[PDB]
Scaffold this active site. Structure first.
Site, PDB file in Angstrom:
ATOM      1  N   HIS A   1       0.824  -1.208   0.000  1.00 44.07           N
ATOM      2  CA  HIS A   1       0.000   0.000   0.000  1.00 44.07           C
ATOM      3  C   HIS A   1       0.859   1.259   0.000  1.00 44.07           C
ATOM      4  CE1 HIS A   1       0.244   0.755   4.530  1.00 44.07           C
ATOM      5  NE2 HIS A   1       0.282   1.977   4.029  1.00 44.07           N
TER       6      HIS A   1
ATOM      7  N   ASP B   1      -0.627  -7.109   2.195  1.00 49.84           N
ATOM      8  CA  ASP B   1       0.114  -5.859   2.184  1.00 49.84           C
ATOM      9  C   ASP B   1       1.592  -6.152   2.367  1.00 49.84           C
ATOM     10  OD1 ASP B   1       0.395  -3.144   1.978  1.00 49.84           O
ATOM     11  OD2 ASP B   1      -0.241  -2.716   4.042  1.00 49.84           O
TER      12      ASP B   1
ATOM     13  N   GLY C   1       2.873   6.857   8.751  1.00 51.20           N
ATOM     14  CA  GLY C   1       4.265   7.025   8.373  1.00 51.20           C
ATOM     15  C   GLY C   1       5.163   5.874   8.810  1.00 51.20           C
TER      16      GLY C   1
ATOM     17  N   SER D   1       4.271   2.570   8.241  1.00 48.43           N
ATOM     18  CA  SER D   1       3.980   1.432   7.354  1.00 48.43           C
ATOM     19  C   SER D   1       5.209   0.907   6.619  1.00 48.43           C
ATOM     20  CB  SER D   1       2.902   1.816   6.328  1.00 48.43           C
ATOM     21  OG  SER D   1       1.701   2.228   6.964  1.00 48.43           O
TER      22      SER D   1
HETATM   23  N1  LIG Z   1      -1.302   1.253  13.854  1.00 47.84           N
HETATM   24  C1  LIG Z   1      -0.985   0.792  12.488  1.00 47.84           C
HETATM   25  C2  LIG Z   1      -1.075   1.936  11.505  1.00 47.84           C
HETATM   26  C3  LIG Z   1      -0.164   2.015  10.431  1.00 47.84           C
HETATM   27  C4  LIG Z   1      -0.250   3.078   9.514  1.00 47.84           C
HETATM   28  C5  LIG Z   1      -1.265   4.088   9.667  1.00 47.84           C
HETATM   29  C6  LIG Z   1      -1.318   5.078   8.783  1.00 47.84           C
HETATM   30  O1  LIG Z   1      -0.582   5.217   7.857  1.00 47.84           O
HETATM   31  O2  LIG Z   1      -2.072   6.094   8.674  1.00 47.84           O
HETATM   32  C7  LIG Z   1      -2.168   3.988  10.750  1.00 47.84           C
HETATM   33  C8  LIG Z   1      -2.071   2.922  11.659  1.00 47.84           C
END
Ligand SMILES: NCc1ccc(C(=O)O)cc1
Length: 239
Positions: free
Chosen positions: A42, A91, A190, A192
């Site tokens: 993603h 993902d 941020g 991910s």
């Molecule tokens: N707690 C996992 C998680 C990971 C990425 C996001 C996000 O990119 O907005 C939000 C939550």
């Protein structure tokens, strides 16, 4: 990363910072071998063009060149064919790194690889693992921290995450949930593609990749992570 503490690349020599040219921060990743960084699909699904990305290894700050860091172009960007969002599915993504001098990564005190798990072999629920990233420190933050951060979170059983007051069915067995007993710390926007590292049999293993979650550090809304021991055939074949 909400809460937690600051750290430098030496405490996560495998963490990779990925950026996009038209140059901003994209996502984190993990080096599993000299030429391959593993991350989340993603993170790239919107700009599949491998030519726009830049990858760094041994970098502890978001907008300052950490001494000893390596810069790499993405010789190849591999997204998981079966990806699907809305609670992302499959993902997971692989980026083959190569510098302008056409070389991969060379281990140092600030650049090491992280081991993958043995098939379907995950720590028991309640185990303490760690997460790394340049993600937001607060959901309402506009900026990303300049210094890398990491925190601890405990694995949650599929049965518990399966609950309605949690994530219901959005969570699949190919997913792992992790969170703080007090929900005071967690991954956020941020983080991910970042690593969920757990100690399995006395060995630091890449157990999960930050994928999604409902908001950040909110009660009953754990962070969800791509369960790596469920994608080994996909990782070995694609690398
Ligand atoms: N707690 C996992 C998680 C990971 C990425 C996001 C996000 O990119 O907005 C939000 C939550």
């Amino acid at each position: 990363i909400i809460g937690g503490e600051f750290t430098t690349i030496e405490n996560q020599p495998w963490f990779a910072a990925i950026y996009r040219r038209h140059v901003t921060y994209v996502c984190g990743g993990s080096l599993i071998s000299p030429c391959w960084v593993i991350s989340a699909t993603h993170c790239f699904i919107d700009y599949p063009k491998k030519e726009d990305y830049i990858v760094y290894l041994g970098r502890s700050r978001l907008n300052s060149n950490t001494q000893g860091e390596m810069k790499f172009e993405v010789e190849n960007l591999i997204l998981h064919k079966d990806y699907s969002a809305d609670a992302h599915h499959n993902d997971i993504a692989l980026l083959k790194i190569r510098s302008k001098e056409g070389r991969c990564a060379q281990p140092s005190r600030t650049i090491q690889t992280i081991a993958l798990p043995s098939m379907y072999n995950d720590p028991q629920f309640g185990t303490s693992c760690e997460i790394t990233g340049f993600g937001k420190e607060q959901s309402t933050d506009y900026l990303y921290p300049e210094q890398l951060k990491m925190t601890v979170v405990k694995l949650i059983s599929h049965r518990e995450c399966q609950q309605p007051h949690y994530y219901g069915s959005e969570v699949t067995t190919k997913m792992l949930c992790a969170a703080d007993p007090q929900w005071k710390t967690d991954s956020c926007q941020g983080d991910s593609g970042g690593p969920l590292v757990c100690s399995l049999q006395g060995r630091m293993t890449l157990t999960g990749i930050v994928s999604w979650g409902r908001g950040c550090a909110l009660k009953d809304k754990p962070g969800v992570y791509t369960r790596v021991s469920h994608f080994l055939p996909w990782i070995r074949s694609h690398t």
